[PDB]
């Protein structure tokens, strides 16, 4: 329902009214992956958000998942202002209210508040040559962009349920980049 919190370890990935994880306020380091429980990652890279979702048995959305979860949001609109630091509340100098961005399914801040990293690769590739930019866990080569969905508070007309940016390498970190978790539906 909500974008990933910084204290996902104690709160879960989806909680109302908490600091949203981004390049600056990066998420707590996953305890399943050598995190001590209070240390945070040094940036907001795709790798980091993908690590966090796994730790909670979730993944980042694919395009087909995103365009679906976020339907019902107000299209081609953005939160405006200079920040959206908190889930379910209005943003810092928001020119429109948070609930304008609420999906048919009650996904809060579905679009145009913060780009969510995705779980699909394509778009713009990096150097066609080995680069050790993976938090020191190997090297990439011709590394394609890792999708970003929805738009953030500052792409006014660009944002929406199908908004998609395929430019950022997975090692990129910015304060407009957070994440939303998904997982399968099990019927027994």
């Amino acid at each position: 329902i909500y974008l990933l919190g910084v204290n996902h370890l104690t709160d879960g990935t989806s909680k109302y009214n908490v600091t949203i994880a981004d390049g600056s306020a990066s998420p707590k380091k996953s305890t399943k992956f050598g995190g001590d429980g209070s240390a945070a990652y040094s940036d907001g890279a795709w790798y980091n958000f993908a690590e966090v979702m796994t730790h909670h048995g979730k993944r980042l959305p694919n395009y087909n998942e995103f365009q679906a979860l976020a339907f019902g949001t107000t299209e081609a609109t953005s939160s405006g202002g200079t920040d959206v630091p908190t889930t379910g509340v209005n943003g810092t100098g928001a020119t429109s209210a948070w609930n304008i961005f609420t999906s048919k399914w009650g996904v809060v801040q579905a679009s145009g508040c913060l780009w969510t990293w995705g779980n699909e690769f394509g778009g713009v590739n990096g150097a066609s040559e080995y680069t050790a930019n993976t938090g020191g866990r190997g090297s990439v080569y011709a590394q394609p962009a890792a999708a970003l969905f929805g738009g953030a508070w500052n792409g006014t007309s660009l944002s929406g349920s199908r908004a998609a940016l395929w430019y950022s390498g997975p090692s990129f970190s910015f304060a407009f980049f957070g994440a939303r978790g998904v997982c399968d539906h099990l019927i027994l």
């Binding site: 081609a76 020119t95 006014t156 007309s157």
Partner: protein, 267 residues
């Protein structure tokens, strides 16, 4: 009060100076070839701000002339159109001060409560439109523009196909509407430049004044300072304007430059 004043070519309908106070409620002031209002010519300088001569046209006042207000240019003025008053003129000033250097008082105009000035200016220091409208007839300068309660600047539609107009302002503040003309396959539009400081929520309505486009090309509508705090939103229905087989949305990026993008319209 509900009076008629007619002036010939050479003169003006009203001259006020030396700290006067004029109110025109209702009635009419015509001055076909000349000015409707003139200010100064008989100087009396003073360190503290006296009654900085004020003219107020209110309760339905009609005023027409080549210029609506003509400033001498020693004295500071304070023109006010209120209560549905309507003046079509120009607002000019002397364009060289008598003593080159050291200051010169402000020329301030307030458009309020349903009023309507229709003209052009590069002489007004500070304009405040508040639930009123300025129909801008030609390229213009203003120092400090403020809007409120649905105040609008309405870039008058040119009968000359293709000719756009520019309003430059030093500082923008408050919250209002800007009706602007756009010419499709010529790829040109009325522009609005703010030079030092912009702030507040504003709205842009878009008039299709040049017929539909061959291609999809973007158009710059608003330029503002680098790290500006001002926001603009397309006022047309649904945040979009349909020009022929195309659809446009207002998107700004980088540095307070609010273009109007558009591409092929939904089938």
């Amino acid at each position: 009060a509900q009076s008629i004043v007619e002036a010939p070519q050479l003169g003006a309908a009203i001259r006020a100076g030396r700290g006067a106070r004029v109110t025109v409620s209702g009635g009419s002031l015509s001055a076909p070839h000349g000015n409707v209002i003139e200010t100064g010519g008989g100087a009396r300088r003073f360190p503290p701000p006296a009654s900085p001569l004020s003219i107020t046209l209110q309760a339905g006042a009609r005023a027409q002339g080549r210029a609506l207000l003509y400033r001498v240019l020693p004295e500071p003025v304070k023109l006010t159109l209120a209560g549905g008053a309507q003046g079509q003129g120009d607002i000019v000033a002397t364009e060289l001060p008598p003593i080159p250097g050291a200051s010169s008082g402000p020329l301030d105009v307030a458009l309020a409560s349903q009023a309507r000035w229709t003209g052009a200016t590069r002489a007004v220091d500070s304009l405040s439109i508040d639930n009123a409208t300025w129909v801008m007839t030609d390229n213009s300068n203003v120092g400090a523009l403020r809007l409120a309660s649905d105040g609008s600047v309405d870039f008058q539609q040119p009968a000359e196909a293709g000719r756009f107009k520019v309003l430059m302002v030093d500082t923008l503040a408050g919250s209002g509407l800007f009706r602007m003309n756009v010419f499709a396959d010529l790829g040109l539009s009325d522009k609005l430049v703010v030079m030092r400081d912009a702030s507040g929520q504003h709205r842009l309505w878009v008039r299709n004044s040049g017929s539909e486009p061959a291609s999809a090309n973007t158009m710059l509508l608003v330029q503002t300072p680098r790290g500006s705090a001002a926001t603009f939103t397309l006022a047309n229905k649904d945040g979009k304007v349909d020009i022929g087989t195309y659809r446009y949305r207002l998107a700004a990026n980088g540095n307070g430059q609010w273009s109007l993008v558009g591409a092929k319209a939904p089938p």
